[PDB]
Amino acid sequence: QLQGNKEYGSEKKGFLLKKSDGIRKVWQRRKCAVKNGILTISHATSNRQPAKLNLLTCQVKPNAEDKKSFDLISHNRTYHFQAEDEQDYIAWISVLTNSKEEALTMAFRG
């Protein structure tokens, strides 16, 4: 019995705001894409290869203090994101969860 939301797909490309780790923790706009249970998040600034997160090993956790915010929690690290509007918020949490669930279904089929 699978979580997500069928109103959305399992792939998305767009922008998200990400809170920086270090420099007074400022919010910064990054290019992000989900496909095949993988989330790719650009850094500032390529230069670097984008970060790649395996959603099967991450928790998606809506943020209790801002309506458009959510976190991705890996084994290692917490990423704080903010969508650019409420519609985009529901789309990202839905696509992330769908992508995870699809992939989990494939993994636990094999």
Q: What angle do CA 44, 16, 84 make, to 5 degrees?
A: 135
The answer to whether the CB of 100 falls within 8 A of the CB of 108 is: no
Is residue 65 exposed (0-12), middle (13-18) or buried (19+ Cβ within 10 Å)? exposed
- Residue 44's domain comprises 1-110
Method: X-ray
Task: Look up the CATH number of the domain holding residue 66.
Answer: 2.30.29.30
d(CA 2, CA 50): 29
Number of domains the chain contains: 1
d(CA 32, CA 38): 10
Resolution in A: 1.8
